[PDB]
Symmetry: C3
Subunit: 366 residues, 3 copies
């Protein structure tokens, strides 16, 4: 008969999912953001430019103000319209002569007399072109496109766990278990050797695996605990949908008190830990202790949840069980984010190198 | 006594191995293949070369055909024999004047008058040398040598699972369990507190852990299932070797219906999940539920497989249990492939950068 | 009642921790050490330098000996004191004329007449500055600072497992279980539904989960084994602290015979495998099979260890359970080491590229 602790294995696997939800899943990768360095190189290039070049960025009446493109259109016989936004950004602080002199000092160009500035300028223009080619590389934008957001990933995880964008509070306000489709009795709600459950997410699966009910507190209702049953008071033969208080008495078996470092490997391990616990039969697969007939919560029956989507003849969880597919999508997105973070560290180092060289007066003359 | 579901833990661990076999393990890493970019840079270098240089690649009678190295030997006083294959490859389409002009346009060199082409040529020759130095780096060939193939990895995984290069079909055609050495009774086949099993791979270990037999369908034979026993009909006291139909009734408990993304971490976790389930005793270690004496399939004995290779005094699975060592070899190969993929993305980005610069007419003049 | 094999799940999880200790955890990452290449580039730069430059590194009396900085101070009107150590290192072998000629040959500079050496020198000085900028990048020292040592990581792991810098020998010499605080009886030592254990590390937790004692050899004392109980002889109602012989009879259930490749993912998986096995109650969480009251080792009570630090209302193991926090610290340090190894492969490849170019006579003239 099913008794105390018989579902500890399954509880652990499902809580490894639950604990990811809320805002607890964290992208601690940070990001290689090299825009600061690129902007500095472009500003250094403008600072070293011939004064008639910086003069193109000035208003013809107030030389301290930026050129307006209606008042002074960019000549059609140039490619200046393709490059103006970045040029004007680099020029804007330099329109102030005192700021231009301050930047000349910041970039180690203020000791240069005209012919020596001309020489350095050639090297700076070359380094600047190389910086743009490295940082504007379509592959850089490719990696940047594969960068995910903690908010987006957290939303998808809460969809897998709760079918909501956010984790329900401790009263489960706004949440209805089994999407309002619970009926009849525990075995109808949780499934059997022939029928699937009414669960659509990981939380409600955990509830079927771990909740006690009115009839099994002395025996099977202790399957996920030690000494004392959860005490849900669930009476599904009379009132099929458990209340929020009931759900929380099961969720509190899981660690909602810490954080998890999001990595594809971590998600993969957690999904496999559930997926291979599914006991594949002819018509359903069962998660949880099962002895006979159905997941009715009786000690001679089962404390479990059943799925028709995978059996001993078909189906993989990450494709065919919706909540698990949703979580596998997070693993996929994380793998791409991880590859992008690695790739983007290269232009970051390269831009730092170029800025070091561009600020080295001896190299520029060389 | 051993009964329904008592081996779910062990089944899950072993199915995490089985599911890797067949063609289901996938190298989704793809590869940084930068040959296209290197070839383009070399062709651009040849396109910009002085016409007497491209003329070295022509047949002396038909200037549209490539030079034959018997007819017109490469002068011994040059190093041209060290470089000819790559040069001739770059020159071949350019021997056609219309194609040479088309390539001049493709690479943004067709607007250049002779003295301006000479200037650009100097920069192109420098960028081309840098491209070769980055992409021919012995460390690039080092990483390329550490690139593995999905086919090779899949073969090794099937060796660990089945002792075959490929996964047996659903009738297990061509396969003999226990390599033909099964004899006597279940406990001789599967092992005991004193003797190791006759299994040599992961499939036949799973069979010992999970198969029902003629004597235990009502009790221990349900150790890996829910309601209904596998129904192998195995009668090892009479006919020791199980048939292919019998083997499949156990393999279908595992997910052979999806795919797994090959990573060293994923293999490592799956091996550890088996290895630390081995219950280490004085003379053998046991995988599966064991109560007394041996792995005979009796509910008072064990549903299990035994190994002499590791005990409470010696042995690590990834070195001393052959099937597990074979799988650990895949983890090792995957770790190197992963490091190589990371390293090779650097020359890929660098070559894209160089091609961007080489096609920028303003940079070339700079 | 708790009987044979009921704690195999928990044993496996805890042995996945124990097996990391000793010297068995291995940083097989190796390291990108590019100092050899940087030193060679700096020596090549000095080899190609004008002879009056190399003469600055000579003693004024014995031209074969290095300049002494008291005898011949570095002029205050230069920045030579900022660069001398690396310059003198590059110059030292070259003070010997025969060695200078040998290095000229090694670096492919010995065929160069004076005007051709002048041309090559310009390129070498430029490549050398680029090498320093790439390898002296503050981000390189940042990554190098995030490089961990196998010795440091191994020490922290032994602290989590044993509260010692090193793994106790097979007699547990120098080690006292429960830090000398064991008293009264097994349930006082190991904890209950209301009180935490006296364990302070992972080894002593494993002992509470897996040791037999004088009263349970026929039943609960077989929870972590197959046929034969560990045979500790522990009599905690009389002598509370187990002896070293007793401890070893439990540790030998774990794999202390192999090695583990240190990775953050591997540590993360092993911690989660323990943490989510903790059965969270109102006042304690329990690791191990528990039926009633306490972890007394009785078959009707529990074979387990209890923690007050996490419950169904608070606490995450990697922050609030000291031994687990200590191991989580290793995961954190490993993640940074892994990111640093990846980042540092970039300057390594770049320096190899530069050395290839600097040794290419045709490129230098270009
Ligand atoms: C770092 O800082 C440097 C400055 O130090 C900055 O350099 C500037 O780069 C831009 C972009 O490369 C240069 O833009 C060119 O500007 C010339 C000059 O235009 C003025 O003068 C002409 C002649 O008197 C006037 O006609 C014109 O109205 C302007 O007043 C333009 O002539 C260039 O346009 C031609 O080339 C483009 C390609 O680059 C074509 O797209 C365009 O259609 C033009 O081509 C036509 O003329 C060609 C003649 O040879 C002909 O071959 C074509 O077929 C076609 O008919 C171009 O816009 C600008 O001069 C640079 N500034 C200086 C002072 O040198 C860098 O941009 C900066 N780096 C970064 C990364 O920001
Ligand atoms: C990008 O595109 C460029 C072209 O724009 C291309 O450049 C070519 O590079 C190759 C390889 O560096 C150059 O090859 C050299 O060719 C000369 C010329 O040979 C002809 O003319 C001589 C003189 O009349 C004849 O004797 C000869 O038979 C040929 O007709 C050779 O002289 C060079 O060989 C010497 O140097 C080699 C080292 O590079 C030695 O290995 C070789 O033994 C030779 O050395 C001898 O002479 C030296 C004299 O100084 C002496 O010092 C040595 O001790 C020894 O006695 C060499 O083969 C070729 O000229 C370039 N082409 C042009 C038009 O400039 C790039 O290769 C391409 N980039 C890439 C990456 O593909
Ligand atoms: C690869 O190999 C090359 C050699 O091939 C090597 O190059 C050497 O680099 C160093 C560092 O850049 C150069 O150091 C400079 O040396 C000059 C020369 O000093 C002598 O001669 C002067 C004049 O007769 C004497 O006064 C002096 O006592 C020495 O005898 C110094 O003048 C330089 O110092 C000035 O510039 C520094 C900035 O680099 C300032 O920090 C310093 O205060 C000095 O500035 C003063 O003078 C300036 C005059 O223009 C003025 O503008 C300032 O405001 C200030 O008043 C400097 O120390 C050395 O010359 C190079 N060697 C050669 C032969 O060219 C590379 O270092 C090597 N690469 C690597 C990576 O190792
Ligand atoms: C589960 O199985 C038991 C035993 O057959 C049965 O009594 C229950 O009614 C069923 O739900
Ligand atoms: C396994 O153990 C049981 C109980 O001792 C025994 O009856 C069987 O014969 C043996 O194979
Ligand atoms: C553990 O629980 C059993 C059953 O109530 C009790 O008999 C023991 O004394 C206790 O330690």
């Amino acid at each position: 008969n099913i008794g105390t602790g018989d579902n500890v294995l399954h509880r652990a696997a499902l809580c490894g999912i639950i604990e990811l939800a809320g805002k607890r899943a964290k992208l601690e990768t940070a990001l290689p953001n090299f825009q600061n360095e690129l902007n500095s190189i472009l500003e250094l290039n403008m600072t070293a430019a011939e004064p008639t070049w910086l003069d193109q960025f000035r208003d013809k009446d107030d030389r301290s103000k930026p050129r307006d493109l209606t008042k002074q259109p960019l000549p059609k016989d140039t490619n200046w319209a393709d490059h103006w936004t970045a040029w004007a950004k680099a020029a804007l602080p330099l329109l102030n002569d005192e700021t231009h002199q301050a930047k000349l000092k910041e970039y180690k160009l203020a000791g240069l007399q005209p012919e020596k500035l001309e020489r350095a300028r050639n090297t700076i223009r070359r380094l600047t072109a190389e910086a743009v080619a490295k940082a504007q590389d379509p592959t850089v934008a490719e990696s940047t496109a594969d960068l995910t957001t903690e908010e987006d990933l957290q939303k998808q995880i809460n969809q897998a766990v709760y079918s909501k964008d956010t984790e329900p509070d401790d009263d489960f306000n706004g949440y209805t278990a089994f999407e309002g489709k619970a009926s009849t009795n525990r075995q109808t709600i949780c499934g059997s050797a022939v029928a699937g459950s009414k669960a659509t997410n990981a939380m409600d699966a955990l509830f079927c695996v771990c909740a006690d009910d009115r009839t099994n507190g002395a025996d099977a209702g202790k399957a996920c605990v030690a000494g004392t049953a959860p005490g849900t008071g669930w009476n599904p033969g009379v009132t099929a949908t458990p209340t929020g208080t009931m759900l929380q008495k099961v969720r509190k078996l899981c660690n909602t008190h810490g954080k998890t470092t999001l990595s594809a490997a971590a998600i993969e391990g957690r999904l496999t830990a559930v997926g291979n616990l599914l006991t594949r039969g002819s018509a359903t697969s069962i998660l949880g202790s099962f002895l006979a007939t159905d997941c009715s919560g009786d000690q001679g029956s089962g404390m479990c949840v059943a799925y028709t989507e995978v059996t001993d003849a078909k189906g993989t969880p990450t494709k065919d069980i919706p909540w698990m597919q949703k979580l596998d999508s997070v693993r996929i997105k994380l793998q791409k984010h991880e590859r992008a973070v690695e790739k983007l560290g290269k232009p970051q180092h390269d831009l730092k190198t170029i800025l070091t060289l561009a600020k080295d007066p001896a190299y520029l003359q060389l």
